[PDB]
Homo-oligomer: A and B are copies of this chain.
Amino acid sequence: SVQTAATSWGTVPSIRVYTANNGKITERCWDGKGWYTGAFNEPGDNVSVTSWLVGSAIHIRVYASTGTTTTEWCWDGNGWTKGAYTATN
């Protein structure tokens, strides 16, 4: 089966659901008005996510894994950028 991860924030709420399907992770978004496909699109067979608010601004971290390699993807208001995470050392 496909594998998913979810996060949410605020009281609307906003929800983001990430799905790993055939080696690709995609993103589905709710901001109160309907579901839409988000900008996130990166390789992975497994996904997890966390997020936090700084005031009203959301910050999201998606951890995408293929084989033994886990890559962190960061949203901080300006598109998806690679994070400093590594699995060891």
Contact = CB atoms under 8 A, between A and B. Distances in A.
B7 A68 contact: no
Interface of A is mostly: strand
A37 interface: yes
A77 interface: no
Given A35-B85, A70-B19, A1 B61 contact: no
Interface in A2-39: 2-11, 13, 15, 17, 19, 21, 26, 28, 30, 34-35, 37
Interface of A: 1-11, 13, 15, 17, 19, 21, 26, 28, 30, 34-35, 37, 44-54, 59, 61, 63, 65-68, 70, 84-89
